[PDB]
Symmetry: D3
Subunit: 340 residues, 6 copies
């Protein structure tokens, strides 16, 4: 009874608690677990490495709130980049290379103008094969033109990175686990500099899944209703007019996200009724799971599978277990049985 | 005389050799140096991290030929990527998600068609505010359409990287110094997969500057004609029609590139006649230099400065040195004077 | 055709070759593969950590022959241990502590003898409660006796380890990957010292599975007959009289063992006919497999799963593939299809 | 005087204090030293790696109390292992392999029974060489029987280690210096699982020798009575009936154990009177010493020598030193002499 | 205005603030900066590696006060060394080797005395070539004499280092960055032992340049008067009678020393009036500067250049900047311009 | 016999071979050992860290010849330093600071000369307290004079180290174990620069003790005559006139030096006859020994103890061992006894 339960707690083990038909057995296991304590759990959370790609991040317990606050500051850095490009020192480097490209165009124009022989500046007949020369200058002016747009972009980029490396340097040393994510944000702010294309905060913020936990009391989730979305989390979508979209902030946590580092108490009967035993088995066997998506939605995300790091306690009556007990994988995963 | 010279050789020192008006003093210093030997020099070379950005790479002596051969193989990998996208397993993943996007469009079309009330399929009057519904479907079909192009790109990309990581893995372990450059090539082949846009070999190949050297005999360059381009190298350009362009293969080595790890014998008189003392001073003081460009060309490269790693021997007559000798920086850089 | 095949070879990929009914298609793929070369494969082999437990060892290519030769020498070390216990220096430490235990017994005997009052040495009536004293001495002599056997064992052990650490020290530095296995052998020789119980060479030798390979030509196995034992290896047993037994030398290699680092050419039809598709799928998915045992044999081994490190080429006719092609896992594992 | 003493304290030095015949000179040196402070001393303690082998452990100051508390918890884990073997999931693996061995015996019995020709089941004449067959089955049933006991042990072991690795993992990371000792305890609990043989707490607990010390005030021991056991500690024995025994908890600390990290004030006269100068000299020279045993006791321990890590101050009158002063080793060890 | 300023603060940037003729613009920038906070600055300070050589040391913020206190204790260690050489154990090693050298002299004297043939001890005629023998003994006695002084020095040295290594060991582990400096002090105390030559505290103490700073508020220096000595610090000299001298304690901090880790507010007009723009430019470009010396003083120090680690804000009116604004290096260094 | 011997060889063990009175038993053990092979022995040698201090160096087998050749080159570097100080660039820095000190003296002289009031340049009466001023200038000129000698030394030193660091840099990377010794040589060449005091090659060369050995055949020394100097090596002395001296080249190797990595065959009888059993015991117990010196020589060296790294085989007749056999330390060190 209590001994089997203590054994489950002390061992690594997933367990199942078997009791009489009376209800609220969950609310007694809960009271019991909430007097224990566990090893401090890290913060596990989702972050966007791009608009489409979402990774799992692990931070020391308590640090995720601070990263999120730091990210809100980085988003406002677009206003600082704007002011940076109003500075005279930048405007001077800028016109300086503009003149470099005016010069090249407006000399090949003056070499094309010294056709005082048969032409007179456009803005004969006949041509005379200086007709080719006209194309040289045209094609060349368009090429110098695109080459100038690019060089301005590269210029804005370089200035932007000079400024941004000062903002980011403290962050890398404060959040070494967030390194790839901070690099992704830095690149994206650099692209705002090149392009002027504004950031949607909702595509770039970290998605904190649960509150940080000391371990005392342990994280504990009771799930009476075991659907796939409630166990595994789900991805929501925005449909504005006819347009579908989605982003990292639209991932909604399930029990595996909220119970990280702790205990997940699950109603067994509900697990059977719902589709979910087979998928639950797979999740436990693999150590990870993805959030539920709507198959055949015209929008999507590449989401890293979320690791399973909790201990599961199934609750039910003998009758409730009988369907489960006849599967050989049941006792392989749920080694300990506990009573009353 | 010989002692001062030995002293220069054994010490780290830049020197100057002072001799009578008779010519071929260079061809005697050369004969002398070519009996010495030096520490094995690494291969120093230029590689493109992008079409516009060029970095310096250091490889163990002899390895650059092998990297260059490996790069020629990587360039031909575009043909392998082509065959990869003719595979049934890929075509099936491809049509599979095509159908996913046809489904979404051609159901919202059938929901838009059940306006048998006042419409009849286009391909009244009046509208009736199902007019808005028509736009939902249009805007939504265009969005699903762009979302599909992107997802195909991401699909081709992912397949491409699966294949390319097998080709690149041996290279990273064989050429750990070439890591950033190999990553740049891998990304570029991945983009050929996304885009179909072919690679210009000349933009992506490493530019080997000198033959590898054992150190015996040492690398030795004699430069009788001390212009900036011949000392520091230069960047060439292609002008085809009126269009200017340039790339990493158009960097032409100077003496600082060819004398790496060894000796640069320089005619002193020529250094004075030409513009070049001031720039030479700067190069030595800074430990690095860039190749000469045509200022105000409408095309350019971002080129990492090339490190100076040679020992310089100035050759001349007493008269030839007098202009140099009156500069305080002269003897600071050229500590040793040698005779005859 | 050749292109798809080259693609399979250059990529990491498992492939399948589809051809006309004509036979010997295998002998042509073989001729082709045997002109390639692969990265040098490590030696993968089975070693016993105990009489019952078998682990996988990885050695640099070519080193396994040398370990096996070293192990043959270690087995003969039992003869050296025998001579060690014939040495006077050891015999003296030995009798020295024998006397220490004779002393303790044969003084408590002389304290028990000074019952000249009512006794006379055994080897009244009545007893007189010196009856308890008789038991003290008995129980005490038996305890001192067992304590002496143990101390002799500990003595032989310590001497044995002094000698054996000199033999083993070069081995640890020559074969750092073999460390746990060498420790197991050292402990077992130490136990021969304690116990006199001889070693069965067949329980302690490493089981080399294939000849070492440079990579040129690659390891290549053709398997026309795809039973579980021939793919995965098997465990044999000795039944001498009615007694069952087994050991690490009775593991027989299959194709996954012989094709390590190279290519496994497999007849597709045979894979279907035999039980084996499902188990083959599992092996590939898991990256590892165990050798086949006779279920319900009264003897067994704990065998570490052997990693799969080969590239598989399925050979067949279109007809031969049709049963396979209708499984979604087929093309997931066999990405590349090649012709003729 | 005070200067020589300060010099002794500040230097590393063993010293001797020479004073008038008046008593309580120790109680004045003590008052003085107890105002100083020293570098924080680690906890040095004895732990059992087996029932017979005792090692020295070093822990950060204050951590030994916590290890000892953790060890008390590990000892009670035998109760948890008991409950573990009452679990249905374990009982099922257990009968499962019991049946595997019943099957093998009770089929070879039915093959032995089909001697309906000349036999009739035992539980002719004559034999007929099926007499050999009877032995096959007997010898084979005994072998299958022993093989079953072993397999049950191995089974209990494996389950036990699954559970115990969860209990031990936090300990290894909390007490990395205690690693060998925790491994020894884990193995011993695993053997309780195999065997049912209970642990004697007194053989497995760490033996804390002194209270932890901050360094302020320093550890200080005054020893007026310099026998070998009081300086070096001793090993006690239990003699219950006639049986001798001993264990790690029966080691009694001496001054070298209690003064670790600090000062040992020693009466010089007493050092002379007692046997102990020669042994004290040796201890200091070697940096270590073992506790005193009763030579020729029929029980013993293998005890790692305990390091000497204190500074010694000899106290006496001029007369008291004269016997010591005439030994050349005296001043080599006691460099500083201090007065009054 | 405020935005440009925030931009300067958040970026790494040197800035200049342009305002109306009204005074106290500095006292407003100051009020503003003193509400910010910066990353904790290390302690940067000057330490003497010898009487003539001065290095820069970096310590964790707050640790320099503790090193300085530790150094004051090390200086007083000369008194402890004095007492050490009054110890009998040392005096005995000392006379012991004195006798060894008396013996050698006063036996070769007794071999020189056994010229009872023609001599009689000095303190004939004629000589007789025992005249050479007289010189042997003389030259030999002088050599044994110098060899004895040296051996006494080496003796005092060795004793001194035995004692000093106990004092220094805690310091090396407490101040690992101060390692070279502590080694220099240890050697110097060892030389006091050899030589008796006392230490001048002023030559050996660390020279703390500013108070340690948490970063809140940031270090801020306002410099209205921009002379070279006030910006860069200066070296003072002592002239006592006609004798010039100087030492590490005579280096006087300038603004670059006091503003380390923070902000240096500088009056622009004053920078122009004084000699100092050119030297300031150089300092910023190089990242370091040396303190001002009196050229052609007959005393000097070898002083490591002090790194520049502050952010500079120039203050002035438009008019005040015009002279500066026309230098291309101005805007290269002062990227941000701020108003009012 | 052979078995005991093989046992000794295979184990780590010191042994003793007991045989009949017939002679040449050594020459048979020798023949036997010279067919074996041992682990490659490092080169163990003596190097001078100063004129008085000698350390043990360990080099990879074969490298000591190369270090010795490198050292011969370093000794000749004094000739290169001479030429360096004949260079104009150095002479100019030199007179430059000479003038700086002439200036200071010959201005305070001209300030002392403007006593045209009551003086007239020396080279009244009465004085007039400008008498003090005369002393200021004198004392000041002497101080400026000594300060100049020092500054020239520091100047020569700095130039010398610039040159020498180029010569030494390859050596540090080629001989990382020789680091302290190379540093000592570099400092000594730097002092030749400061001082002009020539180096005695014999005080600075490494003293190679034995030829390098592959291990096949093993190093083997037979010692029939077991005096202390022949076992342990000795220090020689030079007595030129009456002056005693000694240096690292005057250390003469004994058997422990020549048998390093191998076998030392020792006549047992000779060990008894000579003083040497007690000292031999000590050497083995300590793992190291020093070479024999003449006690009470007026010259000496501080010599690091040389490690013992050989296996010892004592040879004799039963009679020869009897004196040894009765010492308890005998069999502790010589565990194995072998016959015939």
């Amino acid at each position: 009874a209590r001994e089997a339960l203590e054994l489950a707690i002390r061992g690594g083990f997933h367990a199942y608690l078997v009791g009489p038909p009376s209800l609220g057995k969950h609310e007694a296991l809960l009271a019991y677990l909430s007097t224990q304590s566990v090893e401090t759990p890290p913060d596990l959370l989702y972050v966007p490495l791009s608009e489409r790609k979402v990774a799992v991040m692990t931070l020391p317990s308590g640090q995720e709130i601070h990263l999120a606050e730091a990210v809100e500051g980085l988003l406002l850095e677009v206003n600082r980049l704007d002011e940076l490009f109003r500075q005279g020192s930048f405007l001077r480097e800028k016109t300086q290379l503009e003149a470099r490209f005016k010069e090249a165009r407006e000399q090949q124009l003056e070499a094309l103008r010294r056709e005082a022989q048969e032409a007179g500046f456009a803005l004969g007949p006949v041509p005379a094969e200086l007709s080719a020369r006209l194309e040289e200058v045209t094609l060349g002016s368009m090429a110098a033109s695109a080459e100038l747009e690019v060089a301005l972009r590269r210029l804005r980029r370089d200035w932007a990175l000079h400024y941004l490396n000062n903002r980011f340097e403290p962050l890398f040393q404060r959040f070494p686990q967030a390194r790839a994510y901070l690099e992704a944000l830095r690149a994206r702010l650099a692209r705002y500099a090149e392009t002027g294309e504004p950031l949607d905060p909702a595509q770039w913020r970290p998605n904190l899944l649960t509150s940080s936990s000391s371990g005392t009391p342990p994280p504990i989730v009771y799930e009476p209703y075991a659907t796939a979305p409630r166990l595994f989390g789900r991805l929501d979508y925005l449909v504005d007019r006819g347009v579908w979209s989605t982003n990292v902030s639209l991932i909604r946590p399930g029990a595996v996200h909220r119970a990280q580092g702790g205990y997940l108490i699950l109603d067994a009967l509900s697990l059977k009724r719902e589709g979910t035993w087979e998928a639950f088995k797979r999740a436990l066997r693999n150590g990870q799971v993805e959030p539920v998506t709507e198959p055949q939605a015209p929008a999507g995300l590449e989401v890293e599978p979320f690791p399973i790091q909790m201990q599961v306690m199934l609750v039910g009556t003998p009758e409730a277990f009988e369907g489960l007990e006849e599967d050989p994988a049941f006792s392989e995963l749920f080694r300990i049985r506990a009573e009353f």
